[PDB]
Amino acid sequence: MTFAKIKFSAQIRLETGLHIGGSDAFAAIGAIDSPVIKDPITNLPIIPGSSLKGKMRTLLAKVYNEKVAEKPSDDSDILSRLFGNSKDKRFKMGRLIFRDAFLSNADELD
RNA sequence: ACGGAAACCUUGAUUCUAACGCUACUUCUAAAUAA
């Protein structure tokens, strides 16, 4: 059945302080010894899509993986057909296109 | 037939140890002068 794209819009609301971290160049000057990853322009906390993708894959590896996942390349067909898999024919590119997460209630916080 | 595909800046770690809201202190003194 023909092409389709389905978008799962949501609003992540931190109930506890988030520490994705990863200060490299801009956030590296944070003077905190563990700065959260920020936007280079607006200096706003950001949840990168890699964090969501990795955490979701590692969490679903405990439910939808009948064999033990020694490596992410050896993941089950279901996980590798969504998150992708570099070492197979059909599952080279996954069906999940994650996006970064930007602050949306900055005005509310003010 | 995108210098592209797969990658959690993650793992553990008590803003914790010691420290008298304490010291002296009678709810008490004075009764004049007139009758």
TrEMBL record:
GO MF term list: endonuclease activity; hydrolase activity; RNA binding
Domain of life, per lineage: Bacteria
Keyword annotations from UniProtKB, A to Z: Antiviral defense, Endonuclease, Hydrolase, Nuclease, RNA-binding
Q: What does the record list as GO biological process? A: defense response to virus
What family, per the record? Belongs to the CRISPR-associated Csm3 family.
- This chain belongs to which protein, by name? CRISPR system Cms endoribonuclease Csm3
